[PDB]
Design a protein around this motif. Structure first.
Motif, PDB file in Angstrom:
ATOM      1  N   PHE A  54       0.827  -1.205   0.000  1.00 24.57           N
ATOM      2  CA  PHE A  54       0.000   0.000   0.000  1.00 24.57           C
ATOM      3  C   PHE A  54       0.866   1.262   0.000  1.00 24.57           C
ATOM      4  O   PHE A  54       0.483   2.267  -0.598  1.00 24.57           O
ATOM      5  N   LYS A  55       2.030   1.224   0.645  1.00 20.15           N
ATOM      6  CA  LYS A  55       2.942   2.365   0.621  1.00 20.15           C
ATOM      7  C   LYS A  55       3.333   2.670  -0.824  1.00 20.15           C
ATOM      8  O   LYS A  55       3.518   3.822  -1.198  1.00 20.15           O
ATOM      9  N   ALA A  56       3.454   1.622  -1.639  1.00 20.62           N
ATOM     10  CA  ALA A  56       3.826   1.750  -3.044  1.00 20.62           C
ATOM     11  C   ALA A  56       2.683   2.292  -3.888  1.00 20.62           C
ATOM     12  O   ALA A  56       2.868   2.582  -5.079  1.00 20.62           O
ATOM     13  N   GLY A  57       1.498   2.415  -3.296  1.00 23.31           N
ATOM     14  CA  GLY A  57       0.382   2.986  -4.035  1.00 23.31           C
ATOM     15  C   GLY A  57      -0.697   2.050  -4.516  1.00 23.31           C
ATOM     16  O   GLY A  57      -1.627   2.490  -5.165  1.00 23.31           O
ATOM     17  N   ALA A  58      -0.608   0.758  -4.211  1.00 23.18           N
ATOM     18  CA  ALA A  58      -1.650  -0.142  -4.680  1.00 23.18           C
ATOM     19  C   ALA A  58      -2.992   0.169  -4.019  1.00 23.18           C
ATOM     20  O   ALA A  58      -3.051   0.505  -2.837  1.00 23.18           O
ATOM     21  N   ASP A  59      -4.073   0.014  -4.770  1.00 21.49           N
ATOM     22  CA  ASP A  59      -5.407   0.258  -4.233  1.00 21.49           C
ATOM     23  C   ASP A  59      -5.955  -0.959  -3.503  1.00 21.49           C
ATOM     24  O   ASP A  59      -6.802  -0.840  -2.602  1.00 21.49           O
ATOM     25  N   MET A  73      -4.854   1.672   6.353  1.00 27.14           N
ATOM     26  CA  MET A  73      -4.390   2.479   5.234  1.00 27.14           C
ATOM     27  C   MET A  73      -5.445   2.882   4.229  1.00 27.14           C
ATOM     28  O   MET A  73      -5.119   3.452   3.189  1.00 27.14           O
ATOM     29  N   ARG A  85      -7.391   0.922   2.326  1.00 23.01           N
ATOM     30  CA  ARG A  85      -7.376   0.158   1.097  1.00 23.01           C
ATOM     31  C   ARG A  85      -8.191  -1.123   1.186  1.00 23.01           C
ATOM     32  O   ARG A  85      -8.900  -1.354   2.170  1.00 23.01           O
ATOM     33  N   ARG A 101     -16.206   6.108  -2.877  1.00 20.26           N
ATOM     34  CA  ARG A 101     -15.193   5.405  -3.637  1.00 20.26           C
ATOM     35  C   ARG A 101     -15.715   4.056  -4.115  1.00 20.26           C
ATOM     36  O   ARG A 101     -15.503   3.671  -5.267  1.00 20.26           O
ATOM     37  N   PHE A 147      -6.244   9.724   4.878  1.00 17.29           N
ATOM     38  CA  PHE A 147      -5.892   8.595   4.020  1.00 17.29           C
ATOM     39  C   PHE A 147      -6.448   7.283   4.580  1.00 17.29           C
ATOM     40  O   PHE A 147      -6.822   6.400   3.810  1.00 17.29           O
ATOM     41  N   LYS A 148      -6.523   7.148   5.901  1.00 12.35           N
ATOM     42  CA  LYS A 148      -7.115   5.956   6.504  1.00 12.35           C
ATOM     43  C   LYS A 148      -8.564   5.820   6.037  1.00 12.35           C
ATOM     44  O   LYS A 148      -9.063   4.717   5.843  1.00 12.35           O
ATOM     45  N   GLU A 184       3.748   9.976   1.471  1.00  8.76           N
ATOM     46  CA  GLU A 184       4.773   9.029   1.027  1.00  8.76           C
ATOM     47  C   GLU A 184       4.606   7.706   1.761  1.00  8.76           C
ATOM     48  O   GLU A 184       4.677   6.628   1.146  1.00  8.76           O
ATOM     49  N   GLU A 185       4.360   7.776   3.065  1.00  7.97           N
ATOM     50  CA  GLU A 185       4.194   6.583   3.883  1.00  7.97           C
ATOM     51  C   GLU A 185       2.970   5.768   3.486  1.00  7.97           C
ATOM     52  O   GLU A 185       2.973   4.537   3.576  1.00  7.97           O
ATOM     53  N   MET A 186       1.926   6.450   3.023  1.00  5.03           N
ATOM     54  CA  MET A 186       0.676   5.768   2.721  1.00  5.03           C
ATOM     55  C   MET A 186       0.363   5.584   1.253  1.00  5.03           C
ATOM     56  O   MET A 186      -0.729   5.136   0.909  1.00  5.03           O
ATOM     57  N   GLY A 187       1.308   5.940   0.395  1.00  3.89           N
ATOM     58  CA  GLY A 187       1.125   5.801  -1.038  1.00  3.89           C
ATOM     59  C   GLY A 187       0.067   6.710  -1.641  1.00  3.89           C
ATOM     60  O   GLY A 187      -0.609   6.326  -2.596  1.00  3.89           O
ATOM     61  N   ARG A 188      -0.055   7.921  -1.116  1.00  2.00           N
ATOM     62  CA  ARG A 188      -1.042   8.840  -1.642  1.00  2.00           C
ATOM     63  C   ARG A 188      -0.436  10.155  -2.109  1.00  2.00           C
ATOM     64  O   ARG A 188       0.788  10.303  -2.162  1.00  2.00           O
TER      65      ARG A 188
END
Ligand SMILES: O=c1cnn([C@@H]2O[C@H](COP(=O)(O)O)[C@@H](O)[C@H]2O)c(=O)[nH]1
Ligand SMILES: O=c1cnn([C@@H]2O[C@H](COP(=O)(O)O)[C@@H](O)[C@H]2O)c(=O)[nH]1
Lengths: 212, 212
Positions: free
Chosen positions: A78-83, A106, A108, B50, B78-79, B104-108
């Protein structure tokens, strides 16, 4: 998802992966990225795809470790951006709950893989699939993955998870699954090779969409 | 974003917000949700949107606190599932960096608001806007918000952030901004009342899209 079609982008080099994904973006807004691409080009490819194509990314990582490790894998993903992330249910409830806890933290989603599409899935997974699906329901899982290659099993899975759950299904095309039949039970189909190995990926995607 | 149009959903009750958003979903795939809706219906509305509409959500929260508090606001946002958050730049670099660190930590993603669209923005914000934009560039910010109501200022902002940065712009319609002129500089326009207070929100969205 757009046109109920998700592209499985399993090419292993960035240039080809970016080319094919860009060519079919008008037909698909959701891409499944797995280890073939990530282990070849790095996790940064997820954010690159998300930005360049404005698509949702499902990390098809088949998470299948102990709870503690599953939590770390989900956090890094998730840090990498995956949904969303695809998690195996055969390792048990605690392992799935670990993934659900990180997704909750997070913002997601977790997709639970219940029965796989390949021949070998009949050996051990198929016999536990109904119980794996019921376990998902008991844990509050709302997104599932089931096999295009066995529509009677996909029907049974839909029966267990209910009409409100979201179900996606791989095994269409190359593995023998049919788009239309699969969509009688699944909300969306995952297609890899039939699109990315085609001489004209956009024409292949368009053809699948027209068939349904 | 789809049709370069982002819906600002500032209605204050869930039923009306869901109705209008559903009516215009074929034209827009990105929605800005702010405090009018969130403080009236709760943060859970972000995940509901969403899921129900499959749209990207920008939390238009105009974050404007000290670093420590900004970090908490971003984490909570983000949560809740937001894909991005709008942050004010006037409180300074440390406050913006706190938001960037959580994204950055949460991929957003973080969008930096540089100059506002309303008349009062001329009093203090406009005079600091160029420097706020340059600060964003220095911090590595890649997403910005600028005013539809002052295209010459939007042009200056685009000049500072470069062609590679993503720029979105509110103040279209009700506040007097023009869609076409704004899109000469911005990548997408944010529209609220001209759509959500229209007798036919879908017709209003379609009309904006046709004008551009
Ligand atoms: O039961 C499953 C689970 N996952 N996948 C995955 O879905 C994609 C299907 O690709 P294909 O269309 O090329 O066969 C691949 O990424 C593969 O790892 C399956 O095929 N079957
Ligand atoms: O400089 C700015 C920054 N943000 N917004 C926001 O963008 C939306 C514009 O709505 P409108 O189309 O109804 O005027 C509202 O949510 C508003 O808070 C502005 O209008 N101007």
């Amino acid at each position: 998802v757009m046109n109920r079609l998700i592209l499985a982008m399993d090419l292993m080099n960035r240039d080809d992966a970016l080319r094919v994904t860009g060519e079919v973006r008008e037909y698909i807004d959701t891409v499944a990225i797995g280890y073939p691409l990530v282990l070849s080009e790095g996790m940064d490819i997820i954010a690159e795809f998300r930005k360049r194509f404005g698509c949702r990314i499902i990390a098809d990582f088949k998470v299948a470790d102990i709870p503690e490790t599953n939590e770390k894998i989900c956090r890094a993903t998730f840090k990498a951006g995956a949904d969303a992330i695809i998690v195996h249910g055969f390792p048990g409830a605690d392992s799935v709950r670990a993934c659900l806890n990180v997704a909750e933290e997070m913002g997601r989603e977790v997709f639970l893989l219940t029965e796989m599409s390949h021949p070998g899935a009949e050996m051990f997974i198929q016999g536990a699939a109904d119980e794996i699906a019921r376990m998902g329901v008991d844990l509050g899982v709302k997104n599932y993955v089931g096999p295009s290659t066995r529509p009677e099993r996909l029907s049974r899975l839909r029966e267990i998870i209910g009409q409100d759950s979201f179900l996606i299904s791989p095994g269409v095309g190359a593995q023998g699954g049919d788009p239309g039949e699969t969509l009688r039970f699944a909300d969306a189909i995952i297609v890899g090779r039939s699109i990315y190995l085609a001489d004209n990926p956009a024409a292949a995607a368009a053809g699948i969409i027209e068939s349904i």
